[PDB]
């Protein structure tokens, strides 16, 4: 779990900016798929989401070497309060109607 | 007739770099006895040659009943 | 199978132990005819490092972490 703070901060940032997210299962990989050119190895990514799910705020969902994230209202409030996010950002799909 | 060295069997000889041909009895078998040089180096090939086994990786698990009666 | 029993040597090895000063005083010091913080540590000339980087001036060599330059005194 020993990873830079900016990594987890950006993980939360992209999770909030997209509302939902996914986790790929591989260690032969160099970094994360959507986090390429960001030197964000997927190992620390799966560490991050397994910590988040073990914390009891995201329901686990898995299919075909991939993990699917969920979004709960309690989780939304917790993420906004902890990250000090402005109380006007909404999940991505609610934008553009 | 300027026949190249690779066509011969004694190309890249041991001891001295030799590429000519000499066909004669009593010395050809000593050249055949080239395992003794490697026997003195106790290599894995040397040990395998000591036991009289096929050093090229041939499976000798239980097969090879010929030559032992 | 049995237990692998990786216990032939080293009855219990632990993590590395690192002890640090509560507030480092070996980095800056007095006694240089200066009222400001006086420079005893070598300043790194490389751009990628700086004055906050303290190459540990041990009994030998300079230990940086990114470039690791070495100076001989003899």
């Amino acid at each position: 779990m020993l990873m830079p703070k900016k990594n987890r901060i950006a993980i939360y940032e992209l999770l909030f900016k997209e509302g939902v997210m996914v986790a790929k299962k591989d260690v032969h990989m160099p970094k994360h798929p959507e986090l390429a050119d960001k030197n964000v190895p997927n190992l620390h990514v799966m560490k991050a989401m397994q910590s988040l799910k073990s914390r009891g705020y995201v329901k686990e969902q898995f299919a075909w070497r991939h993990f699917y994230w969920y979004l709960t209202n309690e989780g939304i409030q917790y993420l906004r309060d902890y990250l000090h996010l402005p109380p006007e950002i909404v999940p991505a799909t609610l934008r553009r109607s | 007739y300027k026949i190249p060295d690779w066509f011969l069997n004694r190309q890249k000889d041991v001891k001295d770099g030799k590429y000519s041909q000499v066909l004669a009895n009593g010395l050809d078998n000593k050249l055949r006895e080239d395992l003794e040089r490697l026997k003195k180096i106790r290599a894995h090939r040397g040990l395998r040659h000591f036991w009289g086994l096929r050093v090229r990786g041939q499976h000798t698990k239980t097969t090879g009943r010929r030559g032992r009666t | 199978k049995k237990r692998k029993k990786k216990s032939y040597t080293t009855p219990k090895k632990n993590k590395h132990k690192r002890k640090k000063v509560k507030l480092a005083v070996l980095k800056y010091y007095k006694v240089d005819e200066n009222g400001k913080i006086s420079r005893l540590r070598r300043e790194c000339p490389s751009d990628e490092c700086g004055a906050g980087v303290f190459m540990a001036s041990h009994f030998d060599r300079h230990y940086c972490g990114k470039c690791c330059l070495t100076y001989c005194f003899n």
Binding site: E18, G19, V20, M21, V22, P33, E34, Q61, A63, W64, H66, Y68, W69, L71, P91, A92, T93, L94 | - | -
Partner: protein, 160 residues
């Protein structure tokens, strides 16, 4: 970007399998029945069939958009080119997946397994199907496992 037709065909089949697996793992609680794909020039829509449309929609229509973004983010397709509809089945009686899930969720909730099997058989036969069989196998009474059958109507098992 493009590949030969055989590889694209098998990749589209793989994508369909992935989609169906994720959906049956997700929305089987909402009476999920099936999925289908339509492809238009530079566009792809995926339609679903499930008994409880209001339950499968959710609140504010959030689940459809959330899942759509999930699949869009999963499969790396150009964004905005995927949309997921909301359709109900023609009937829950002649669909094997729907009745299998009904039996599943009658079994999980706590009920005599043979009562549930009898009920599903009656429901099938009032639906008008020409016949069916359901096999429930496992540990019902004791530690031994006996595969247990129910048949009604007539069923064919051979040929095309």
């Amino acid at each position: 970007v493009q590949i030969s037709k055989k590889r694209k065909f098998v990749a589209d089949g793989i994508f369909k399998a992935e989609l169906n697996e994720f959906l049956t793992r997700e929305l089987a609680e909402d009476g999920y029945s099936g999925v289908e794909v339509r492809v238009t020039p530079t566009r792809t829509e995926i339609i679903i069939l499930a008994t409880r449309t209001q339950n499968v929609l959710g609140e504010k229509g959030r689940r459809i958009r959330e899942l759509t973004a999930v699949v869009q983010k999963r499969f790396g397709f150009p964004e905005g080119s995927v949309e997921l509809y909301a359709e109900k089945v023609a009937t829950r009686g002649l669909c094997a997946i729907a009745q299998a899930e009904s039996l599943r969720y009658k079994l999980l909730g706590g009920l005599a397994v043979r009562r549930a099997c009898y009920g599903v058989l009656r429901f099938i036969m009032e639906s008008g199907a020409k016949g069916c069989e359901v096999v429930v196998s496992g540990k019902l009474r004791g530690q031994r496992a006996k595969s247990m059958k129910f048949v009604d109507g007539l069923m064919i098992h051979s040929g095309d």
